[PDB]
Tab-separated table of C-alpha atoms and ligand atoms in Angstrom:
chain	number	residue	atom	x	y	z
A	1	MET	CA	54.254	105.394	107.670
A	2	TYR	CA	55.227	107.181	104.419
A	3	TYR	CA	58.698	105.632	105.097
A	4	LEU	CA	57.082	102.216	105.563
A	5	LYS	CA	54.331	102.626	102.975
A	6	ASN	CA	56.433	103.426	99.900
A	7	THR	CA	57.647	100.879	97.394
A	8	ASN	CA	61.371	101.496	97.482
A	9	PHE	CA	61.833	101.636	101.187
A	10	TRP	CA	60.291	98.237	101.739
A	11	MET	CA	62.086	96.811	98.702
A	12	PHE	CA	65.581	97.941	99.531
A	13	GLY	CA	65.096	98.033	103.296
A	14	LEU	CA	64.997	94.366	102.562
A	15	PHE	CA	67.903	94.334	100.158
A	16	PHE	CA	69.904	95.689	103.083
A	17	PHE	CA	68.547	92.902	105.337
A	18	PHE	CA	69.549	90.133	103.024
A	19	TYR	CA	72.976	91.513	102.293
A	20	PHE	CA	74.045	90.946	105.843
A	21	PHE	CA	72.767	87.377	105.805
A	22	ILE	CA	75.171	86.438	103.157
A	23	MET	CA	77.796	88.705	104.646
A	24	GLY	CA	76.942	87.339	108.047
A	25	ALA	CA	77.560	83.742	107.091
A	26	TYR	CA	80.511	84.732	104.868
A	27	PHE	CA	82.690	86.623	107.375
A	28	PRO	CA	82.769	84.428	110.537
A	29	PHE	CA	81.903	81.245	108.626
A	30	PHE	CA	85.112	81.878	106.640
A	31	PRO	CA	87.855	81.281	109.190
A	32	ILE	CA	85.863	78.396	110.584
A	33	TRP	CA	85.034	77.155	107.093
A	34	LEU	CA	88.709	76.977	106.286
A	35	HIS	CA	89.613	75.218	109.554
A	36	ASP	CA	87.095	72.449	110.265
A	37	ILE	CA	86.238	72.258	106.615
A	38	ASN	CA	89.407	72.989	104.743
A	39	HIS	CA	92.031	71.936	107.245
A	40	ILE	CA	93.581	75.251	106.440
A	41	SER	CA	96.938	76.265	107.849
A	42	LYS	CA	98.142	79.763	108.724
A	43	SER	CA	100.286	80.051	105.631
A	44	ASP	CA	97.080	79.323	103.712
A	45	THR	CA	94.776	81.532	105.805
A	46	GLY	CA	97.380	84.259	106.116
A	47	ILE	CA	97.532	84.499	102.390
A	48	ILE	CA	93.848	83.762	101.852
A	49	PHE	CA	92.946	86.712	104.017
A	50	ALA	CA	95.823	88.981	103.047
A	51	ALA	CA	95.256	88.237	99.414
A	52	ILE	CA	91.614	89.174	99.839
A	53	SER	CA	92.821	92.640	100.731
A	54	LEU	CA	94.594	93.080	97.383
A	55	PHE	CA	91.232	92.952	95.698
A	56	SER	CA	89.919	95.107	98.546
A	57	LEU	CA	92.585	97.452	97.435
A	58	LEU	CA	92.484	97.220	93.637
A	59	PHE	CA	88.870	96.284	93.097
A	60	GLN	CA	86.761	98.543	95.244
A	61	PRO	CA	88.122	101.901	94.071
A	62	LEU	CA	87.650	101.299	90.399
A	63	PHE	CA	84.332	99.903	91.547
A	64	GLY	CA	83.251	103.128	93.343
A	65	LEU	CA	84.466	105.383	90.526
A	66	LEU	CA	82.265	103.284	88.204
A	67	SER	CA	79.368	104.074	90.562
A	68	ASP	CA	79.349	107.675	89.360
A	69	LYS	CA	79.644	107.131	85.611
A	70	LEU	CA	76.735	104.718	86.315
A	71	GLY	CA	74.895	107.200	88.426
A	72	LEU	CA	71.706	105.543	89.622
A	73	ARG	CA	71.859	102.680	87.129
A	74	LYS	CA	71.308	99.192	88.637
A	75	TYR	CA	73.586	97.571	86.013
A	76	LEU	CA	76.513	96.944	88.393
A	77	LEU	CA	74.488	96.183	91.512
A	78	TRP	CA	73.213	93.196	89.480
A	79	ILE	CA	76.783	92.214	88.634
A	80	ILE	CA	76.794	91.801	92.397
A	81	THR	CA	73.703	89.723	92.979
A	82	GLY	CA	74.905	87.711	90.007
A	83	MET	CA	78.170	86.596	91.565
A	84	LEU	CA	76.715	86.417	95.041
A	85	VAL	CA	74.025	83.987	93.930
A	86	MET	CA	76.409	81.295	92.778
A	87	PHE	CA	77.743	81.532	96.375
A	88	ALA	CA	77.105	77.859	97.192
A	89	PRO	CA	78.377	76.348	93.879
A	90	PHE	CA	81.353	78.659	93.841
A	91	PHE	CA	82.564	77.994	97.442
A	92	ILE	CA	81.769	74.336	97.847
A	93	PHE	CA	83.096	73.455	94.416
A	94	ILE	CA	85.778	76.087	93.675
A	95	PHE	CA	87.760	76.841	96.834
A	96	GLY	CA	87.353	73.428	98.299
A	97	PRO	CA	89.184	71.901	95.265
A	98	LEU	CA	91.771	74.457	94.282
A	99	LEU	CA	92.619	74.168	97.957
A	100	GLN	CA	91.926	70.529	98.961
A	101	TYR	CA	93.344	68.858	95.838
A	102	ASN	CA	96.481	70.711	97.136
A	103	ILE	CA	96.819	74.017	95.134
A	104	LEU	CA	96.483	77.026	97.519
A	105	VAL	CA	97.914	80.116	95.768
A	106	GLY	CA	95.422	79.919	92.913
A	107	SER	CA	92.377	79.062	95.045
A	108	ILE	CA	93.034	82.320	96.857
A	109	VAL	CA	93.702	84.875	94.161
A	110	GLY	CA	91.266	83.096	91.887
A	111	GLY	CA	88.752	82.967	94.710
A	112	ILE	CA	88.985	86.557	95.867
A	113	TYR	CA	86.379	87.806	93.365
A	114	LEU	CA	83.018	86.234	94.218
A	115	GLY	CA	84.904	87.027	97.405
A	116	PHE	CA	85.160	90.735	96.454
A	117	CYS	CA	81.364	90.914	96.406
A	118	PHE	CA	81.463	91.492	100.131
A	119	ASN	CA	84.090	94.231	100.624
A	120	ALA	CA	83.389	96.725	97.874
A	121	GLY	CA	79.816	95.547	97.480
A	122	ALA	CA	79.178	96.717	101.029
A	123	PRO	CA	80.043	100.345	100.364
A	124	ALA	CA	78.338	99.433	97.114
A	125	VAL	CA	74.807	98.457	98.273
A	126	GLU	CA	75.390	100.868	101.156
A	127	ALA	CA	75.890	103.532	98.499
A	128	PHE	CA	73.362	103.003	95.724
A	129	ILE	CA	70.533	102.406	98.175
A	130	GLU	CA	71.646	105.650	99.794
A	131	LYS	CA	71.083	107.645	96.559
A	132	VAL	CA	67.708	105.950	96.230
A	133	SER	CA	66.904	107.364	99.662
A	134	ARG	CA	67.365	110.927	98.371
A	135	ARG	CA	64.847	110.137	95.655
A	136	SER	CA	62.094	108.748	97.825
A	137	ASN	CA	62.563	110.736	101.047
A	138	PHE	CA	63.672	108.332	103.751
A	139	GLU	CA	67.238	108.319	104.799
A	140	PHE	CA	69.447	105.243	104.584
A	141	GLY	CA	69.494	106.262	108.239
A	142	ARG	CA	66.696	103.820	108.903
A	143	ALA	CA	67.601	101.517	106.035
A	144	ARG	CA	70.868	100.373	107.565
A	145	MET	CA	69.113	99.943	110.923
A	146	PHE	CA	66.620	97.752	109.141
A	147	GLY	CA	69.155	95.898	107.127
A	148	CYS	CA	71.422	95.338	110.092
A	149	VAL	CA	68.893	92.870	111.533
A	150	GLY	CA	69.752	90.303	108.912
A	151	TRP	CA	73.297	90.479	110.312
A	152	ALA	CA	72.126	89.723	113.797
A	153	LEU	CA	69.777	86.935	112.786
A	154	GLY	CA	72.010	85.227	110.282
A	155	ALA	CA	75.072	84.936	112.471
A	156	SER	CA	73.037	83.067	115.072
A	157	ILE	CA	71.463	80.743	112.574
A	158	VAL	CA	74.919	80.456	111.062
A	159	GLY	CA	76.654	78.832	114.020
A	160	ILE	CA	73.747	76.586	114.817
A	161	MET	CA	73.034	75.420	111.252
A	162	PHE	CA	76.692	75.544	110.289
A	163	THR	CA	78.126	72.669	112.257
A	164	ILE	CA	75.038	70.631	111.616
A	165	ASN	CA	75.725	70.887	107.873
A	166	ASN	CA	77.948	73.643	106.500
A	167	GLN	CA	77.120	72.372	102.939
A	168	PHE	CA	73.647	73.618	103.916
A	169	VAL	CA	74.328	77.110	105.275
A	170	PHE	CA	75.651	78.219	101.936
A	171	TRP	CA	72.496	76.836	100.359
A	172	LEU	CA	70.286	79.071	102.494
A	173	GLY	CA	72.716	81.946	102.416
A	174	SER	CA	72.948	82.012	98.625
A	175	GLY	CA	69.359	80.868	98.235
A	176	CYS	CA	67.338	83.378	100.190
A	177	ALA	CA	69.940	85.810	98.875
A	178	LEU	CA	69.465	85.166	95.148
A	179	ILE	CA	65.723	84.518	95.186
A	180	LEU	CA	65.068	87.660	97.219
A	181	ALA	CA	67.879	89.550	95.483
A	182	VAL	CA	66.393	89.165	92.026
A	183	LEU	CA	62.955	89.335	93.618
A	184	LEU	CA	63.919	92.852	94.716
A	185	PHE	CA	65.245	94.005	91.326
A	186	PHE	CA	62.010	93.626	89.319
A	187	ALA	CA	60.564	96.312	91.598
A	188	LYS	CA	62.612	99.510	91.196
A	189	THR	CA	62.842	103.306	90.569
A	190	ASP	CA	63.904	104.859	87.235
A	191	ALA	CA	62.890	108.451	86.421
A	192	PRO	CA	62.318	111.775	88.257
A	193	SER	CA	59.136	113.404	89.640
A	194	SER	CA	60.435	116.913	90.678
A	195	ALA	CA	63.715	115.352	91.821
A	196	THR	CA	65.709	116.793	88.851
A	197	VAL	CA	66.522	115.047	85.506
A	198	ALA	CA	70.369	114.911	85.529
A	199	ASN	CA	72.242	112.360	87.724
A	200	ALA	CA	74.732	115.134	88.568
A	201	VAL	CA	71.945	117.166	90.231
A	202	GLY	CA	70.746	115.348	93.362
A	203	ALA	CA	73.552	113.344	95.006
A	204	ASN	CA	76.416	115.543	93.781
A	205	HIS	CA	79.941	114.236	93.952
A	206	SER	CA	83.499	114.939	95.192
A	207	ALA	CA	86.936	114.739	93.534
A	208	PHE	CA	90.648	114.033	93.990
A	209	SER	CA	94.012	114.373	92.183
A	210	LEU	CA	97.829	114.650	92.106
A	211	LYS	CA	98.044	118.162	93.601
A	212	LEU	CA	95.466	117.394	96.312
A	213	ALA	CA	97.539	114.319	96.882
A	214	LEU	CA	100.815	116.148	96.366
A	215	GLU	CA	99.556	118.537	99.012
A	216	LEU	CA	98.517	115.984	101.583
A	217	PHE	CA	101.959	114.387	101.549
A	218	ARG	CA	103.271	117.890	102.128
A	219	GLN	CA	101.281	117.904	105.403
A	220	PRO	CA	102.734	116.243	108.529
A	221	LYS	CA	99.345	115.282	109.957
A	222	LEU	CA	98.854	112.694	107.255
A	223	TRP	CA	102.068	111.015	108.329
A	224	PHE	CA	100.940	111.007	111.948
A	225	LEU	CA	97.363	109.936	111.242
A	226	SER	CA	98.381	107.184	108.880
A	227	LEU	CA	100.827	105.725	111.438
A	228	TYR	CA	97.788	105.445	113.642
A	229	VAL	CA	95.413	103.977	111.164
A	230	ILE	CA	97.965	102.003	109.339
A	231	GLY	CA	99.775	100.804	112.403
A	232	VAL	CA	96.686	100.152	114.531
A	233	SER	CA	93.912	99.019	112.134
A	234	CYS	CA	96.390	96.831	110.188
A	235	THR	CA	97.493	95.225	113.416
A	236	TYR	CA	93.999	94.937	114.978
A	237	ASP	CA	92.304	93.911	111.805
A	238	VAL	CA	94.847	91.172	111.108
A	239	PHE	CA	94.167	90.003	114.586
A	240	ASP	CA	90.334	89.904	114.385
A	241	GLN	CA	90.628	88.256	111.005
A	242	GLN	CA	91.880	84.990	112.480
A	243	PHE	CA	91.027	85.559	116.090
A	244	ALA	CA	88.005	83.358	115.671
A	245	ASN	CA	89.670	79.936	115.255
A	246	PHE	CA	91.487	80.705	118.480
A	247	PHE	CA	88.200	81.477	120.235
A	248	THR	CA	87.281	78.002	119.015
A	249	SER	CA	90.126	76.251	120.889
A	250	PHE	CA	88.461	77.183	124.159
A	251	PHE	CA	85.296	75.050	124.083
A	252	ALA	CA	83.867	71.770	125.185
A	253	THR	CA	83.694	70.962	121.479
A	254	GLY	CA	84.171	72.445	118.054
A	255	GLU	CA	80.403	72.243	117.460
A	256	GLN	CA	79.653	74.390	120.546
A	257	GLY	CA	82.672	76.570	119.974
A	258	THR	CA	81.316	77.706	116.642
A	259	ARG	CA	77.866	78.304	118.180
A	260	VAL	CA	79.096	80.709	120.840
A	261	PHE	CA	80.755	82.702	118.161
A	262	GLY	CA	77.419	83.255	116.299
A	263	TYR	CA	75.848	84.194	119.592
A	264	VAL	CA	78.499	86.761	120.363
A	265	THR	CA	78.677	88.549	117.010
A	266	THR	CA	74.889	88.631	117.124
A	267	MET	CA	74.605	89.847	120.710
A	268	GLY	CA	77.231	92.326	119.676
A	269	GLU	CA	75.502	94.730	117.305
A	270	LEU	CA	72.956	95.309	120.080
A	271	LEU	CA	75.918	96.750	122.007
A	272	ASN	CA	76.937	98.646	118.872
A	273	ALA	CA	73.685	100.613	118.966
A	274	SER	CA	73.773	101.521	122.621
A	275	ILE	CA	77.223	102.967	122.135
A	276	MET	CA	76.884	104.926	118.885
A	277	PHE	CA	73.580	106.405	120.063
A	278	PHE	CA	75.869	108.421	122.396
A	279	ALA	CA	78.934	108.274	120.180
A	280	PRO	CA	78.533	111.805	118.708
A	281	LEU	CA	77.967	113.450	122.102
A	282	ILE	CA	80.686	111.330	123.637
A	283	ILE	CA	83.073	112.235	120.815
A	284	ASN	CA	82.344	115.970	120.511
A	285	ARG	CA	82.347	116.175	124.282
A	286	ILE	CA	85.762	114.430	124.103
A	287	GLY	CA	87.566	115.057	120.869
A	288	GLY	CA	88.661	113.393	117.687
A	289	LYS	CA	92.292	112.870	118.687
A	290	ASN	CA	91.000	111.278	121.853
A	291	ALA	CA	88.237	109.168	120.370
A	292	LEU	CA	90.843	107.189	118.373
A	293	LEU	CA	93.285	106.717	121.190
A	294	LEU	CA	90.657	105.429	123.586
A	295	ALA	CA	89.675	103.163	120.698
A	296	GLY	CA	93.196	101.969	119.983
A	297	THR	CA	93.920	101.499	123.684
A	298	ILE	CA	90.919	99.178	124.037
A	299	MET	CA	92.115	97.166	121.088
A	300	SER	CA	95.614	96.903	122.546
A	301	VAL	CA	94.071	95.550	125.713
A	302	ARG	CA	91.902	93.198	123.602
A	303	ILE	CA	95.073	91.748	122.148
A	304	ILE	CA	97.427	91.685	125.079
A	305	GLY	CA	94.263	90.352	126.698
A	306	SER	CA	94.702	87.187	124.652
A	307	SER	CA	98.276	86.097	125.506
A	308	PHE	CA	97.092	85.877	129.095
A	309	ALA	CA	93.871	84.066	128.502
A	310	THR	CA	92.820	80.575	129.486
A	311	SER	CA	89.048	80.244	129.846
A	312	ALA	CA	86.414	80.203	127.151
A	313	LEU	CA	84.349	82.559	129.267
A	314	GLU	CA	87.462	84.708	129.458
A	315	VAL	CA	87.423	84.848	125.660
A	316	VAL	CA	83.792	85.865	125.597
A	317	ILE	CA	84.812	88.963	127.523
A	318	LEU	CA	87.658	89.590	125.057
A	319	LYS	CA	85.434	89.487	121.969
A	320	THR	CA	82.822	91.877	123.311
A	321	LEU	CA	85.546	94.487	123.490
A	322	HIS	CA	85.233	94.397	119.694
A	323	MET	CA	82.011	96.286	119.837
A	324	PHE	CA	83.445	98.822	122.207
A	325	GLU	CA	85.980	99.896	119.662
A	326	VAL	CA	83.742	99.884	116.655
A	327	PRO	CA	81.707	102.997	117.330
A	328	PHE	CA	84.549	105.053	118.596
A	329	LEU	CA	86.905	104.287	115.751
A	330	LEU	CA	84.321	104.814	113.028
A	331	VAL	CA	83.079	107.963	114.738
A	332	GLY	CA	86.446	109.262	115.757
A	333	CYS	CA	88.388	108.353	112.620
A	334	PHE	CA	85.526	110.245	110.955
A	335	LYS	CA	85.303	113.336	113.185
A	336	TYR	CA	89.074	113.583	113.528
A	337	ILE	CA	89.454	113.986	109.804
A	338	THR	CA	86.786	116.656	109.652
A	339	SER	CA	88.363	118.337	112.654
A	340	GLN	CA	91.927	118.747	111.558
A	341	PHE	CA	91.352	118.443	107.825
A	342	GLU	CA	90.253	120.795	105.055
A	343	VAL	CA	86.939	119.290	103.813
A	344	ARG	CA	88.248	119.234	100.277
A	345	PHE	CA	90.483	116.416	101.416
A	346	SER	CA	88.146	113.667	102.767
A	347	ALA	CA	87.840	111.722	99.501
A	348	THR	CA	91.579	111.902	98.948
A	349	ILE	CA	92.180	110.988	102.569
A	350	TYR	CA	90.229	107.708	102.395
A	351	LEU	CA	91.577	106.913	98.965
A	352	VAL	CA	95.194	107.548	99.970
A	353	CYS	CA	95.100	106.937	103.710
A	354	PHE	CA	92.640	103.974	103.862
A	355	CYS	CA	92.440	102.364	100.412
A	356	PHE	CA	96.003	102.558	99.098
A	357	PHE	CA	97.625	102.627	102.473
A	358	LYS	CA	95.709	100.380	104.809
A	359	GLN	CA	94.801	97.518	102.587
A	360	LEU	CA	98.439	97.520	101.530
A	361	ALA	CA	99.949	96.713	104.941
A	362	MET	CA	97.460	93.993	105.658
A	363	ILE	CA	98.563	92.045	102.608
A	364	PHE	CA	101.931	92.055	104.324
A	365	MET	CA	101.155	91.856	107.990
A	366	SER	CA	98.455	89.213	107.508
A	367	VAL	CA	101.038	86.835	106.009
A	368	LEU	CA	103.576	87.881	108.659
A	369	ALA	CA	100.928	86.959	111.186
A	370	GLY	CA	99.719	83.761	109.574
A	371	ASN	CA	103.343	82.712	109.634
A	372	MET	CA	103.896	83.903	113.191
A	373	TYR	CA	100.880	81.761	114.196
A	374	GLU	CA	102.021	78.562	112.535
A	375	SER	CA	105.561	79.129	113.675
A	376	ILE	CA	104.915	80.507	117.181
A	377	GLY	CA	101.308	79.727	118.111
A	378	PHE	CA	98.339	82.064	118.523
A	379	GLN	CA	98.989	83.664	121.893
A	380	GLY	CA	102.741	83.743	121.292
A	381	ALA	CA	102.586	85.932	118.206
A	382	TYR	CA	100.068	88.106	119.956
A	383	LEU	CA	102.712	89.557	122.251
A	384	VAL	CA	104.208	90.772	118.998
A	385	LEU	CA	101.071	92.393	117.591
A	386	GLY	CA	99.339	93.600	120.682
A	387	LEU	CA	102.626	95.042	121.921
A	388	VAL	CA	103.348	96.727	118.653
A	389	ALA	CA	99.704	97.668	118.747
A	390	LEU	CA	99.844	99.480	122.116
A	391	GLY	CA	103.271	100.788	121.273
A	392	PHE	CA	101.820	102.541	118.251
A	393	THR	CA	98.705	103.681	120.112
A	394	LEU	CA	100.935	105.217	122.789
A	395	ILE	CA	103.045	107.153	120.262
A	396	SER	CA	99.881	108.476	118.671
A	397	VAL	CA	98.763	109.978	122.000
A	398	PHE	CA	102.059	111.825	122.379
A	399	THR	CA	102.117	112.590	118.579
A	400	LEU	CA	98.642	112.765	116.898
A	401	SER	CA	97.242	116.194	116.102
A	402	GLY	CA	96.105	118.620	118.778
A	403	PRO	CA	92.918	117.643	120.608
A	404	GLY	CA	92.185	121.308	120.000
A	405	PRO	CA	94.188	122.721	117.033
A	406	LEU	CA	95.159	126.379	116.504
A	407	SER	CA	91.358	127.290	116.374
A	408	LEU	CA	89.057	124.458	117.677
A	409	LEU	CA	85.826	126.415	118.445
A	410	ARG	CA	85.854	128.201	115.036
A	411	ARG	CA	86.061	125.006	113.070
A	412	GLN	CA	83.893	123.156	115.751
A	413	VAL	CA	81.352	125.660	114.462
A	414	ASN	CA	82.293	124.315	111.021
A	415	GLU	CA	81.120	120.801	111.949
A	416	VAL	CA	77.986	122.050	113.728
A	417	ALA	CA	76.919	124.567	111.047
B	501	LIG	O1	82.801	93.839	107.018
B	501	LIG	C1	81.477	93.861	107.533
B	501	LIG	C2	81.446	94.773	108.759
B	501	LIG	O2	81.957	96.049	108.331
B	501	LIG	C3	82.050	97.069	109.383
B	501	LIG	S1	82.778	98.623	108.622
B	501	LIG	C4	84.288	97.914	107.856
B	501	LIG	O3	84.932	97.019	108.847
B	501	LIG	C5	86.136	96.345	108.319
B	501	LIG	C6	86.606	95.307	109.374
B	501	LIG	O4	85.766	94.161	109.294
B	501	LIG	C7	87.208	97.473	107.903
B	501	LIG	O5	87.622	98.259	109.052
B	501	LIG	C8	86.546	98.450	106.793
B	501	LIG	O6	87.440	99.487	106.356
B	501	LIG	C9	85.262	99.057	107.387
B	501	LIG	O7	84.682	99.920	106.427
B	501	LIG	C10	80.668	97.293	110.080
B	501	LIG	O8	80.741	98.262	111.124
B	501	LIG	C11	80.137	95.907	110.627
B	501	LIG	O9	78.855	96.103	111.268
B	501	LIG	C12	80.036	94.915	109.422
B	501	LIG	O10	79.043	95.365	108.467
C-alpha cells in the first residue's frame, strides 16, 4: 500500500535488509573467523573485542553528533557503504596478515575502523532512515521489521556457506552489500513538499552539557543504575562476545558446530518478536525496576548455566535464553529511565551512562576475561563472571530505584500521555 508503493520505503526498507546481512555475517562469523581461521587466542580475541569497544566508545558519539550538523545529508551514510564494501579485501587481506604474520596489537586497533562500520553505523542507518520515515509517512516501525529479515536469512546462509568456504561468505556479504548499497543511493529524497524547509524543523533534536552532567552525578540513582548496567551488561556482553567458540566445542564437528550457531541466532529473532509484542504490556504491568532485574537474573542463569554444561543440546537451551533477555532489557532499560528520570536527561544518560561508562568497562573486562579463558578455561572463568553477574543483579534488586517512586501514577500518566 502507500507504505509499499512509495519510492523511499522500498529503497531503504531494503537498505535495512542488507545491513543485517553484512552485520549478520560479521558478528557471529567474527569469533569463529578468528578461531578456525585465525587460530586466535584469548589474549588476541580479548583485546580484539575489547579494543573494538574503544572505537565503539570514541567513534560513535562524534559520529552521531555529526549526524545533526549533516541533518538529512547522505554524505556520511556513504562513508559507510564505502568502507563496508571493501569488506572482503579488507578482512581477508588486512586482519589475516597483521595477525597471522604475527603482529596482533596493530591488526586490532588498525582493524577496528572498517570494523566501526557496524557499531555506530547501526544507530547510524537506524537513524537516518528513521528521519526519512518522517518525510515520507511510514514509520521505521515497519522498516526495521523489514530489514530484520536480512539478519535472519544471512545468519543461516552464513553458517552453511561459511565452513564450506569462508573466503566466499565475505564475497557475498560485501558483494550484495556494495552492489545493492550503491544501487540504493542513486534513488533518494532531497527537498521538501509541505514537510518544512529547515532541517531543524521536522526531526527536532535534544541536548546535553556539564551542568546536566554535573547534576546527574549529584543524583544517587545514576550510581545505582550504572552499577546495574555497567556491572551486568559489561559482564553479560563480554560473555556473549566469546560465548560462541565455546558453543562450538560441543559438536560432532567444527563444520556442524558453526551451522547450529547460524540456525540458533536465526531462529532467535522469531522469539524476539513474540516477546516484545507483549513487552510493553508486560513491562508497564510489571515495572521498570523489575523488568531489568528479571532480565539480569536470566542472564546470570545463562552464565552460571554454562559452568555446569556438558551437552551440545544443553548449550542450545543456554543460547536461546539470549532472546529472552533482549526484549526485557531494551524495554526495561528504556522504560526505567523514563520512569525515574527527568526527560531532559535521556540523551545525557545514554551518553554518560552507556557510551562513556559501559563501553569503558568492556575494554577492561573483555581482556580480563580473554585472559581468564586462556589461563583458566571457558567454564572455569564463568564462575567468576556469572557469579559476579548474579551478585550484582541481586544487589540491584535490593538497591535499584523504587518500583513505584514517590509518585508512580502521576508520572505513569507522563509516559502514557
Ligand atoms: O549488534 C547487533 C545487534 O544489536 C542489538 S542492540 C545492541 O546490542 C549490543 C550487544 O550486541 C549492545 O547491547 C548495544 O548497546 C545495543 O544497542 C539488536 O537488538 C540485535 O537484534 C542486533 O541488531
